[PDB]
Amino acid sequence: EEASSTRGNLDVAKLNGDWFSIVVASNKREKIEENGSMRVFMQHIDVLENSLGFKFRIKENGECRELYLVAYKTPEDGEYFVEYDGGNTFTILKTDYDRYVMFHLINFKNGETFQLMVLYGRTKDLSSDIKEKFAKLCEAHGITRDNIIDLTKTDRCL
Amino acid sequence: EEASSTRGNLDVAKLNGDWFSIVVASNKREKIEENGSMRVFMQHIDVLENSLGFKFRIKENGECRELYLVAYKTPEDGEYFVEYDGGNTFTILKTDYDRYVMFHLINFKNGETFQLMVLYGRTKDLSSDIKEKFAKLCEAHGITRDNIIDLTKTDRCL
Amino acid sequence: EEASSTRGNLDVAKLNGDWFSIVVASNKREKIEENGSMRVFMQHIDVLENSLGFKFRIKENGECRELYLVAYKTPEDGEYFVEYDGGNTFTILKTDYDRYVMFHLINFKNGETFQLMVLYGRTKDLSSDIKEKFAKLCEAHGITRDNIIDLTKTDRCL
Amino acid sequence: EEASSTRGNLDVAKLNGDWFSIVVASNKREKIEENGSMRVFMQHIDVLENSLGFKFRIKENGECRELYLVAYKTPEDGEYFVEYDGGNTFTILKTDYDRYVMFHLINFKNGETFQLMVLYGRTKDLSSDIKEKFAKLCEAHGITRDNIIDLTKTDRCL
Numbered sequence A, B, C, D: 001e002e003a004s005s006t007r008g009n010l011d012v013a014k015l016n017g018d019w020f021s022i023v024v025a026s027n028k029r030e031k032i033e034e035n036g037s038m039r040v041f042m043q044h045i046d047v048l049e050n051s052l053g054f055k056f057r058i059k060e061n062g063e064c065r066e067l068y069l070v071a072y073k074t075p076e077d078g079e080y081f082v083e084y085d086g087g088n089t090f091t092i093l094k095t096d097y098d099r100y101v102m103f104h105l106i107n108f109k110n111g112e113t114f115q116l117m118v119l120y121g122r123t124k125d126l127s128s129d130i131k132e133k134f135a136k137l138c139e140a141h142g143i144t145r146d147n148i149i150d151l152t153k154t155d156r157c158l
Helices: A128-139 B128-139 C128-139 D128-139
Strands: A020-025 A041-048 A051-059 A064-073 A080-083 A087-095 A100-109 A112-121 A148-150 B020-025 B041-048 B051-059 B064-073 B080-083 B087-095 B100-109 B112-121 B148-150 C020-025 C041-048 C051-059 C064-073 C080-083 C087-095 C100-109 C112-121 C148-150 D020-025 D041-048 D051-059 D064-073 D080-083 D087-095 D100-109 D112-121 D148-150
Touching: A020 A128, A041 A112, A041 C064, A051 A080, A064 C041, A064 C064, A087 A128, A100 A128, A112 A128, A128 A148, B020 B128, B041 B112, B041 D064, B051 B080, B051 D051, B064 D041, B064 D064, B087 B128, B100 B128, B112 B128, B128 B148, C020 C128, C041 C112, C051 C080, C087 C128, C100 C128, C112 C128, C128 C148, D020 D128, D041 D112, D051 D080, D087 D128, D100 D128, D112 D128, D128 D148
Parallel strands: none
Antiparallel strands: A020 A041, A020 A112, A020 A148, A041 A051, A051 A064, A064 A080, A080 A087, A087 A100, A100 A112, B020 B041, B020 B112, B020 B148, B041 B051, B051 B064, B064 B080, B080 B087, B087 B100, B100 B112, C020 C041, C020 C112, C020 C148, C041 C051, C051 C064, C064 C080, C080 C087, C087 C100, C100 C112, D020 D041, D020 D112, D020 D148, D041 D051, D051 D064, D064 D080, D080 D087, D087 D100, D100 D112
C-alpha cells in the first residue's frame, strides 16, 4: 500500500488520475493563506515522460484561475523540479495510491527558502486518521500545528 | 580567483559574458561525440533572475543550429536544473571568472543517468595547464582520460 | 451544435475532455506518416487560462511517448500558437462539441510552411458522414484525398 | 538602410546585439507607466532558430529584475509570438539596423487587446528626428501623443 519516492519503492504510474487538495501546511503561512501562491486546489495529476503534469485551480483576486504545470524528474532520488513562484524541489513523501498522497516541497526565491507539505486525496475529503498522520509528519519537519490548514472547510474553487 | 557554487563562495554575477567550449568529458562517450546532444559549442552565458541563460550552437545533421536554454536555481546548494535531453542537474565546480569555468552535470532520462563535465574558456582556447587540472577532475569523478574530448581542434560551429 | 473559432461563435469551454485522433490530412504527407511529427494520437484537451492544454501520444521509434503541450490564444480571431516542430498557428474550424472537432493548422520551420488538418472525435471512431464532411474541407484547403489518412485503422498507441 | 518584417525585406540577422529602450507608446497608458508590465528596459536581442531572444530589465516594486523571453516566428508574414502578460503578436515595423528598430505589438488577455509600439536604439538615446518619425507612426496607429513616453529621461534600470 504505502510507497515513497524518497524511500525508492514508489510506482508513480499509479498516481495518475484525479486528486483533491485536503490539507496544506507551511511555516511561511502567508503562502498557504488567502491569496497565497501555494494555496492551490489540485484537480488531476498526469504521468508523462520523465515528468508529472498538474492541473489545478487557484483563486487569484476572487477569481478561480485554471492552470497546469509540468514538473521534471531530476537525477537525485525522488526529486522533481517545477518553476512556480521560484524554483521548487519536491518529493513524494507517502502514498497508498488510491486514497492519499503526501508531497514535501522546498521553495527558493531571491535568496530565501521555505518548506511546504500537502495532502491530496482521491476524494473531496479524507479520513480523520489520514489527517493526523499528516499533521505529525508536518511537525516532524518543523512545521507547527498552527500552520497546518485544512482546505476541506473552505472553497476549493469547486 | 577560484570560487565554486558547491563550495558556496561563488559570485555567479561575474560569469556573465562570452564563453567558448574547450573540453567536454563524459563516460557515456556517445553523447559528447559527433551528433551527440551534449557536444555543445557554448557562446554566451547570461545571468538572470534566479537562473542562467545559455546561448550555444549545436551541429544537428551537419547544420549548426542556434539555441538558448534557461537553467533554474534549485533549493540545494549550487544546483541548477535545465530540461535538455532529459532532466539535468549541474553545478559550478571551479572558476577563476575571467579565464575558465568547469561545470559538472548529471543527466536523467528514462531510468538512466550519466555524468558530464565541461571546461569553458573566455578565449577560443586555454592554457595547457588549465586543461590538465580539468583532466584530473574528470578522473576524480570516474571519467577516464579516453572520454575527455578537446573540442578546440574541431569545428565548434564557428 | 456547430461553432467555430474563426466564425467567432465557439464556446471553447465545452472542448474540455477526452478526444481521439480519427483522421489527419496534410499535403506534406511525410509529416502525417509513420514516424511523422504531426502523426499525433490525441487523448485529452484541457481548457486553461488564455490557452489550451493537449495531452497526446506519439510513436517515436516504435515507442509510444506521452506528451503535453500548451497552446496560447493570440490577438487574432480564433488563432492559437504552439511551438512544436516549428511555429504553429491553428484554429478551430468546426465543432459540434460532443462528437467532433476539426482543427486547421499551419506550420513554419526554417523558411518553410505547410497545412495540417485533423478530425478529433470524443469516441474511438466517428460517423462515416463526419469523415466525409472533413474529407471535403481538406479538399477545400488544397489537401488532396491521397493525403487524408484515417488513423482509426492503425495503432493509435492504445 | 530601412527594412521591415511586414514589408518583407528585413534581414533579422542584423538585429543581433545590444539595444536600449528609448520611447514606448500605448493608448492603454497604465501598461507603459510606472509598475506597468510593458514598461520594459531592453538590453540585448539574440537571433536564434526560428525565433528571437530578448534580455531586458523591469522594475518590479522598486527592484530591477533581469528577464529573458523567447519569441517564435509564426506562419503569417513578419509575425512573432511571445507569451507575456497575455498572448502577444508583434512585427518589426521599421529598422535601419545600426541605429533604431520600431516594433509594433498587440496584446490579448482575458477577452481584451491593446496596441504597443516601441523604439529601440543601439545607443542610450537617439536622434530627435528618429523620435519624431516614431511619434508619427504612433499617431498613424491610433496612439495619441499623450501616450508616447520617452524613457531616456527616467531610470532604465541602468
